Design an enzyme around this catalytic site. Structure first.
Site, short mmCIF file in Angstrom:
data_model
loop_
_atom_site.label_atom_id
_atom_site.label_comp_id
_atom_site.label_asym_id
_atom_site.label_seq_id
_atom_site.Cartn_x
_atom_site.Cartn_y
_atom_site.Cartn_z
CD1 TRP A 5 -2.96 1.09 0.42
CD2 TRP A 5 -2.31 1.73 2.47
NE1 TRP A 5 -3.85 2.04 0.87
CE2 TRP A 5 -3.48 2.44 2.13
CE3 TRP A 5 -1.72 1.97 3.72
CZ2 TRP A 5 -4.08 3.37 2.99
CZ3 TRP A 5 -2.32 2.89 4.59
CH2 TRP A 5 -3.49 3.58 4.22
CE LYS A 43 -9.93 -0.28 4.04
NZ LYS A 43 -8.64 0.18 4.83
CG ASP A 79 -1.89 -1.81 7.94
OD1 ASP A 79 -3.06 -2.17 8.15
OD2 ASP A 79 -1.68 -0.85 7.15
#
Lengths: 396, 396
Positions: free
Chosen positions: B130, B246, B211
């Site tokens: 990312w 999410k 993460d």
């Protein structure tokens, strides 16, 4: 990696709140943190806020991310509150606003933007000021210097000392102003004093940073913005970090704005792209709920009417407590003139109590104020006033 | 002060979303940003979320500020999700959690904490990763180095290259791991691979940074945390930046956590005071609404049951689209083996499309993916699959 980290210095003001909640004395009185209490000593949700939250509950169909700068209607409403509808700054598109997590968030974003994109090396803050200003700017890599502000003998703005001490500010330094309801003094510049500052600031090449956390708490929404607007009429460039925590009772929802102003549209759009980059590397995009509540209110005639009246109610309750405080002090045998309290603006004034008197108040009387002797007038009520004033009289 | 500021480099991925909304073609398909769409192509609010928001509307009586680290029940629920209930980390009180504005917010807080309080000079990220990881760490003053990860020929984790390239990491460097659903590859280490990494990491003196943005999207809530828990069983110290954007569909409410783990209670409390200081100089305290929704759900048996099923529904819909995608590709005349897509985890895999093929897809077919050829499988539906696959076949 963490074995040798030393503890952060206790924050005496958050340490105060912590001490308050552990206090089992029934008649305890909280005059510390800047929160609005109603006449029953509670910190309510505004009715206009509840109505807006119902509307969002019934109508929101997604939580899709906001843009980096947040809700567009929020930005539009914020600039109108700041600059006035029909302002040339808005018409000329000289301003860009990012919705931020509170006024604190807006201060950090401004500091990060300045440190990373300009030659700014220092920020001037008033002495005294809200302690978090130094902390935020220092954390961004900026030095903080202090300018004279307060004439404690006359309980007034020492305008001569202020101007004289600001003379040591170089072209390209930032000078921080409180838009209204100076924290902690309650003393604001007059329109005339603001106009003189706006003139000085231009001549001297300072970048004005307004911290505007209490719009509506001194005299009213438009009146409270007069100082900012005097600067905005004079300056090509300005930054405003504003908050809706206090005037919407939305503290924990973290609702604020960082507004950047430049000479023209091309410039501000260019500079704002770097402000957006700073935000992106921080929290990415701001939280929707509190800001949608604000935008829903400011942009609906009926809700805005209800909210403006609720804000008026809050301002007037504080003004009543200011008067009641000085009256009850006189009645309770206080030696001192406390009349200066009536003239001061917002939630706070300096009581003139020493750090030892405040420690006594807390330990012996369960009355909580900060070490500077600053008291939250919005924490006073008709029910708590008598015990409060009897406690103060006892420690004088 | 702002005349000479140069514009920030356009973010091609946010620039993609911007391009999408300006596209007037009716059959346009969005496979870019990592958002869950339902089978009607909408991005709904979860039912458990709506029920929790109703409850808050009816029961909240104040918006008084949260503590710097947010809602205590949120922290407790977060640590249980992370480490498992009855975990020794929790029993030994080795972990402290700050509620943050999203996983992005949690990454920034961790980076600021590390830069200001430890000897950390660099973070290792996977290649690929990312892109925001580099950005966030660099903005905090940290160098970013890359480790090998992806075997694109075999569509697999190149475990040998990973281990070999991580050998250049010094004792005291941070190594970033994705907890599950690696962005962008969809390739995660097996339990065995995670255990080997946890062992290597201890021997080599790396500080693990997890993460964890997609817990529940690979196999399930507990299964997805297996890698983290293998590290947690091995390490004295660890940091986790997690997100509920999410798995709760709460993107715009900015709901995440930064969890610090140390050898013992005294140490973690000491180090966490400095993490709280970093937060204080940033946004001061986190936004309540999204995190109260999460805490209200995780701590109520009935709501948690409904939410866990909604999450299961999302995970299974994605798995169905993975299979449907490869099936329709075969049926539509695609030359290539796309079977690797079925095995991959979370919203994303690398399609293997070139940057030019994706540009063609967008310009000629209104199909939006990122330059790397990464596609959001959660953006595929039974209704859009045929036109999507006909478009891909056309560009091969």
């Amino acid at each position: 990696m963490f074995e040798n980290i030393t503890a952060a210095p206790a924050d005496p003001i958050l340490g105060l709140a912590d001490l308050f909640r552990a206090d089992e004395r029934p008649g305890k009185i909280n005059l510390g943190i800047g929160l609005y209490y109603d006449e029953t000593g509670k910190i309510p949700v505004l009715t206009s806020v509840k109505k807006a939250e119902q509307y969002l509950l019934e109508n929101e169909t997604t939580k899709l991310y906001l843009g980096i700068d947040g809700i567009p209607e929020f930005g539009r409403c914020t600039q109108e509150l700041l600059f006035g509808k029909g302002s040339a700054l808005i018409n000329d598109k000289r301003a860009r606003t990012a919705q931020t997590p509170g006024g604190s968030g807006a201060l950090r974003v401004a500091a990060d933007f300045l440190a990373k994109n300009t030659s700014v090396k220092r920020v001037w803050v008033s002495n005294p000021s809200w302690p978090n200003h130094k902390s935020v700017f220092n954390s961004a890599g900026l030095e903080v210097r202090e300018y004279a502000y307060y004439d404690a003998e006359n309980h007034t703005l020492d305008f001569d000392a202020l101007i004289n001490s600001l003379n040591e500010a170089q072209a390209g330094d930032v000078v921080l102003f409180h838009g209204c309801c100076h924290n902690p003094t309650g003393i604001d510049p007059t329109l005339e004093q603001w106009q003189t500052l706006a003139q000085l600031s231009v001549e001297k090449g300072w970048l004005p940073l307004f911290d505007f956390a209490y719009q509506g708490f001194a005299r009213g929404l438009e009146e409270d913005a007069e100082g900012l607007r005097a600067f905005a009429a004079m300056h090509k460039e300005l930054i405003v970090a504003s908050s809706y925590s206090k005037n919407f009772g939305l503290y924990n929802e973290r609702v604020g704005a960082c507004t950047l102003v430049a000479a023209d549209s091309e410039t501000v759009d260019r500079a704002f792209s770097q402000m957006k980059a700073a935000i992106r590397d921080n929290y990415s995009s701001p939280p929707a709920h509190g800001a949608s509540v604000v935008a829903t209110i400011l942009s609906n005639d009926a809700l805005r009417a209800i909210w403006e009246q609720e804000l008026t109610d809050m301002r007037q309750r504080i003004q009543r407590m200011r008067q009641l405080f000085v009256n009850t002090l006189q009645e309770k045998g206080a030696n001192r003139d406390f009349s200066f309290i009536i003239k001061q603006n917002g939630m706070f004034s300096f009581s003139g109590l020493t750090k030892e008197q405040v420690l006594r108040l807390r330990e012996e009387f369960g009355v909580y104020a900060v070490a500077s002797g600053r008291v939250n007038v919005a924490g006073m009520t008709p029910d708590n006033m008598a015990p409060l004033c009897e406690a103060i009289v006892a420690v004088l």
